[model samples]
Every structure is written in structure tokens, then in C-alpha cells.
Target: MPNFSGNWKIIRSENFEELLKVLGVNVMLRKIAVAAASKYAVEIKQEGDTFYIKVSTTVYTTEINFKVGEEFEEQTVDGRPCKSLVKWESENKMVCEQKLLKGEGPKTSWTKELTNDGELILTMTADDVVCTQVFVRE
Candidate 1:
């Protein structure tokens, strides 16, 4: 398994706007989000079973820390409140399920993978919409 604990720079992204649209984000914010996706920096650190993750864009930075298999709270970029759980699916990948707390409790899942080339790929799915973002070293 390649190491996932490193600073990553986003090199490519796909269909992020559609994912936000499916999440019911406002057009104004979605535009900003789409425009900002390519310029993201992601940092991941792991110790034992705990993980620390941070994401940064030009406008803001968000940080999260959790132990594998424990439930965590999250506020989606689209502004939905959610309870999320993440787990290791394999040596090279981790998967997360996030359930919105309101409405009918809709859910989303995203997969994190470290490629052979040490690139990070985030594949986020909200209902039928999928967004893929790839990140590389600084």
C-alpha cells in the first residue's frame, strides 16, 4: 500500500459542478466551487488508526480528524449537515458514507485511493452524480 499521508495538489477534476447541483447547492456557490476545485490543496496524515485531513482552497480551509470505523460529523461543501463514517476498503483505498441528517436521510459516498504513482484520487458520488478529482504532490 502506498502512503496517503502527504500534501497533495489538485491536478485535475471532473463533473464537480454536477455533483454540487445534485446536492442542491445554490447556483452562485456552485459556480465558485467549480471555479475553485482545480486550485485545491489536500493534506492527509495518519497515526495508528487515527487520521487527520485538511483541504484548502483560496477562500477557506477545513480540517477533520477521525479514527477509522468511528462516526464523524461533517458539513458538506454544499451546506448539508451529515453524519459520516469511513473505513479502509483495501490496502490502497478508503471509502466513506455520509448521510444527510434532514429530509429523507439521503446519503452519499466517496472513495479515496492512492495510486501507484502516488497520486490521490477522490471519487465522490451523490445519488447518481459522480465527481472525480485527482491530486498530485506539490
Candidate 2:
């Protein structure tokens, strides 16, 4: 299995603001998020069968701990609550499915892959919007 333990920082993103818009984020918050897009940091640690993820930014910080193939509750950075399930899609890739628990927001899925060049690539999908973010080890 690919070990994702590392400190990472976002270097590039595409359609991230659009994804937030699809989830009903207000325009002001969307602009703030876009402005700080490249400032987010992610830390991942793997201990035995469990993975811990910490995503931090100037605006907010969130932590998630889970095991492969297990279900958990998640409150996203934008404050959306959801039920989440994570599983390994391949040796070097993991996928998570999140179902929104309130309102009419669409379900979201995220795929994270460790690339050969030592970068982390994350793809998030909801409705017709797809957001791609690339991170480099820090």
C-alpha cells in the first residue's frame, strides 16, 4: 500500500470555487476561499490500520481520523455535516464518499492519489462540478 504520511501544501487548484458554489456557499465566502486556496496545509499520518488527516488554513482547521472501509461522520471545512465512508481504491489511491445530511446539497466524492512524482492529487466531485487540487510534499 502507498504510505501517505507527510506534510503537504496545496500548489494548484481547478474549479474549487465552483464546487463551493454548487454546495451553496455565499459569494463572499467563495471569494475568500479562492484567495486563500494555495495557503492550505495538510498533514497525514498512518498508524497501523488507521489514518489521521489534519487540514489547516488561516480560516479554519479540521481533523479526520478513520480506517479503510469504515464509516464515520464528518463536518467539512465549509461547515457541512455528512456521513462519510472511505476505502482504498487501489494500492496508491483512496476514495471517500460523503452524503450530505441536511438541505438539498448533492452527494460528494473525493479521490486522493499518490503520484509517481511524489505529489498528491485530490479530485472532488459533486453534481456536475469537478474540482482538482494538487499538493506537493512540504
Candidate 3:
């Protein structure tokens, strides 16, 4: 099994701002978010069936704790409420679905994979926009 328990820092992002725009974020805030997205750092802790994820940036920090196959409430950094569920596709890959509540945004899906090269690849999709972010172990 691929172990994803480590600190990872964002190295690159593609179409992240467009994803935010699809989420109804204002242009000004999107600009600020785009600037800070490159500074994101994430710490992942996997214990048995449970996963804990801590995301930190210069603008904000948040933590999420969930078990595989269980649904949970998640609030995005932009303060959007979502019903989220995550499931493992394989030992090295996981997929997350987020249904936005009380918003004009479309449902979002995220796929995360641990690459053989020890990098974390995250792909997020909402509506017609798809964003990819790559992270390296820190």
C-alpha cells in the first residue's frame, strides 16, 4: 500500500482559479486565492481506515478528519458548506465527492493519488472546469 502520511507542499497548479470561479468566488478573492494556492502545505495522517488531513497556507488553515466510506460535513476555505464523502479506489488512490449546499456551484469531485515518484497528485473537477495540483513531500 502507498503510505501518504507526510507533509506535502504544493509545487504547481493548473486551472485552480477557474475552479474557484465555478464555485462562485468573486474575482478579487479569486486573485488572492490564486496567489496563495502555491503556498499550500498539507499534512496527512492515515491510521487504519481513518484519514486526517491538515491544510495550511498563509491565509488560512483547516483540518478534516474522516473515515473511508463515511460521509462528513466539510466547510471550504471560502466558507462553502458541503457534504463530502471519500473512498479509496486503490491503495495508492482515493476519490472524494463534495456536494455543495445552498450554493450555485456544481458538485465537485476530487481524485488524489500517490505517485511512484513520491509525489502527490490532486485533480479537482467542478462543472466543466478541471484543476490539477501537484505536491512534493516536504
Candidate 4:
């Protein structure tokens, strides 16, 4: 099975602008995110069916822990206050439901698939956009 049980380093990012665009990020923010890609890192640890992920970027670092079909709270990408939950659909697939403060109601859920070939694919529904990034061992 695809075990995301260790640390991963960002090797490259493609379609990143599309991700920012879907997230309502401005051009200036996208530029900054692209420039900081090299410094981004991810660490995931799994215990039984539960998992914890630590995402570290030049701009921020945060930790998230959730189990399949469980509800947990977390902060948004822009540090906007929010509550969210992640559901593990499979070993490589996950869904996240988040409630934000800026929009009319709760933001749409996101579906993500972690490729065993070392690719991270994130699909957001608010805009029906997909973004992918490649990773390598460090």
C-alpha cells in the first residue's frame, strides 16, 4: 500500500498558479508562493488508521491530525480562522471539509490523492480545479 509514513521534500510544483487562483489568491501572493516552493516540506506519520501531517513552507508551518471519518479543526491556508475535517477515503485518497468566514457558507470539500509515483494531486471543488506537485525523499 502507499504508506505516507515519513518526511517528504518538495521537488517541483506544476499548475501551482491554478491552485492559488482557485483559492482566491492574488497575483502577488502567487508569486510569493511560487518563489517559496523550494523551501516547502511535508512530514506525515501514521498510526493504525489515523495520520498526522506537518506541512512546512517558507511562509508558515502547521500540523494536522485526523482519522478517516473523523472531524477535526484546523486553520486555513491564509491563516484565516476556520474549522475543518479530513476523511481518509483510501490509503491514497482523502477529502477535507472546511468552514470559512469570508464566503457565504462553508467552502466546498477538497479531494486529494497521493500518488505512489511521488506526486501529490489536490482537487478543490469551489472552482473545480486540480493542482499537482512532485516530491522527493530528503
Best by lDDT: 3
TM-score of each: 0.91, 0.92, 0.91, 0.76
Count of steric clashes across candidates, in order? 0, 0, 0, 0
| Cα lDDT of model 1 by residue, 79-98, tens digit | 67788899998887888888
Per-residue CA lDDT of model 2 for 1-138, tens digit only, reads 557888999999999999999878999989988988878888999876588999888877889999988899887435788888888888779999988777656768888899988999999888788999999989
Candidate 3 local lDDT, residue 29? 89
Q: Distance (Å) between predicted and true CA of 46, model 1? A: 1.0
Worst 10 residues of 2 by lDDT: 75-84
Q: Write the per-residue lDDT of candidate 3 for residues 1-138, one digit (tens) a residue.
A: 558888999999999999999878999989989998989998999888798999899978899899989998887445688888999999879998987776666768888799999999988888788999999999
**Can you list the residue pairs that collide in candidate 2?**
none
Models, CA RMSD each? 1.6, 1.6, 1.6, 2.8
Residue 84, candidate 4: alpha-carbon lDDT: 71
In model 1, where do residues sit more than 4 Å from their true spots? none
